């Protein structure tokens, strides 16, 4: 089961030129494409090795789409200012996210298409891909325009068709990088706080995909209450890292085990501090 997503950001300037448009494409937790309107020569560019099979005609075509969407977002930003009666002085943000989820047979599971204005939910295509949920009275104006323009039907055509067919093509071309599960490299470190307590930090490094569970156990019992978890973070090589830390009494370390659940591990892996 896999997903493709496109994330767009448009950021208006207060008479500092037209809005900047940035797009990223993701298959699962791998970025494969990008477009930046502020680049010297704005063009879709590759970000994963498996999209580089695609020839010159693919980058030229997708560049047309982002350039049109940049113009579309610019118009959308002008209208949004009016809906909310905001000054032309302020900088504003329109974000979009759309894409498809497929199963192992490559059949559509779920379609997505939603927008955010200044960090708030604005409008979202419903699960049925025929209707829209508006978050407020400005979004209802958009809803009404789009119901008149039969917009959902065009979005549904892309989500159930094109989206699925592209994701299937990428899953055949990047099969061993996209259906891989890199297991995490795991280790525990020990940092004395004081005379009485020490920190035990459980590391997970170089794993893909990002989804992971680190859990500290004392004599097989969960201590998630006393566990500090960092947010899962990119290593910068398309793999992720995470750590879990628990403050334990000095001399009780051998009673603590770290439990790592990850797709790349056949079953959950159990770690202890190794002095």
């Amino acid at each position: 089961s896999h997903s493709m997503r496109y994330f767009y950001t448009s950021v208006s300037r207060p008479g500092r030129g037209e809005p900047r448009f940035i797009s990223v494409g993701y298959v699962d937790d791998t970025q494969f494409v990008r477009f930046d309107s502020d680049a010297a020569s704005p063009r879709e560019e590759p970000r994963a090795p498996w999209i580089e099979q695609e020839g010159p005609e693919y980058w030229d075509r997708n560049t047309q789409i982002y350039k049109a969407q940049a113009q579309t977002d610019r118009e959308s930003l002008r209208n949004l200012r009016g809906y909310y009666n905001q000054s032309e002085a302020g900088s504003h943000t329109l974000q979009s996210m759309y894409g498809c989820d497929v199963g192992p047979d490559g059949r559509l599971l779920r379609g997505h298409d939603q927008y955010a204005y200044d960090g708030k939910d604005y409008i979202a295509l419903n699960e049925d891909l025929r209707s829209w949920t508006a978050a407020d009275t400005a979004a209802q104006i958009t809803q009404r325009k789009w119901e008149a323009a039969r917009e959902a039907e065009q979005r549904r055509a892309y989500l159930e068709g094109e989206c699925v067919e592209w994701l299937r093509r990428y899953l055949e071309n990047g099969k061993d990088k996209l259906e891989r599960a890199d297991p995490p490299k795991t280790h525990v470190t020990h940092h004395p706080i004081s005379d009485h307590e020490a920190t035990l930090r459980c590391w997970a490094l170089g794993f893909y995909p990002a989804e992971i569970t680190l859990t500290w156990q004392r004599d097989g019992e969960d201590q998630t209450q006393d566990t500090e978890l960092v947010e899962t973070r990119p290593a910068g090589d398309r793999t992720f890292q995470k750590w879990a830390a628990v403050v334990v009494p000095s001399g009780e370390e051998q009673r603590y085990t770290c439990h790592v659940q990850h797709e790349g591990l056949p079953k959950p892996l159990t770690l202890r501090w190794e002095p």
């Binding site: 693919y58 997708n62 789409i65 979009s96 065009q154 892309y158």
Partner: peptide, 10 residues
């Protein structure tokens, strides 16, 4: 590949 059809304005 992203949506070929122009998306309507908000």
């Amino acid at each position: 590949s992203p949506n070929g059809t122009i998306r309507n304005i908000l």
